[PDB]
Amino acid sequence: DRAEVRNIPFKLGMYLTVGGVVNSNATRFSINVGESTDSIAMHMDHRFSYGADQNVLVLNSLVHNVGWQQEERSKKFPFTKGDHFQITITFDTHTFYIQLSNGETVEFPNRNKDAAFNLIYLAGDARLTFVRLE
């Protein structure tokens, strides 16, 4: 089952740091910040091989009973199957600030202007090893 932190509010100004390991033959895994598995304010998918996407990040939001909004992509991909990764996220009213394993950064809009989130979870072909939310 997915790895998740639930009902510990991730509030404006706090930092989230997750560490984990990518599966050896992973297709893709995502890190997700939102309210539920059907309501995601920041989805960041790490695609090793998914349709036409090879070694790319795909970011988006998921709206409950509505679906996926406008995707954003990054070619930054310091991720390796079988190896550890670390991701750090913080946000303000307008922007999610994401930092990747190698120090490179991606930003994604806070489309609802949310000030807090009650669910963080990893899905797909990876596992989490540690978390700091504070």
Ligand X SMILES: OC[C@H]1O[C@@H](O[C@H]2[C@H](O)[C@@H](O)[C@H](O)O[C@@H]2CO)[C@H](O)[C@@H](O)[C@H]1O
Which of 58/126 has CB closer to a second copy?
126
- Print the binding letters for residues 65-94 with ligand X: x by CB under 6 A, - otherwise: ---x--x-----------------------
Residue 13 exposed, middle or buried by CB count within 10 Å (0-12, 13-18, 19+):
exposed
| In the block, residue with structure tokens 């970011």 | 59
What's the closest the beta carbon of residue 33 comes to a second copy, in angstroms?
A: 15
List all residues 6 or more positions away from 131 whose beta carbon is below 8 Å from its beta carbon: 5, 16, 17, 18, 19, 120
Residue 134 neighbours by CB distance under 10 Å: 9
For the bound state, the minimum distance from the C-beta of residue 58 to ligand X, rounded and expressed in Å, comes to: 5
Contacting positions for ligand X (CB under 6 A): 43, 45, 58, 60, 68, 71
- Binding residues for a beta-D-galactoside, by number, are 68-74
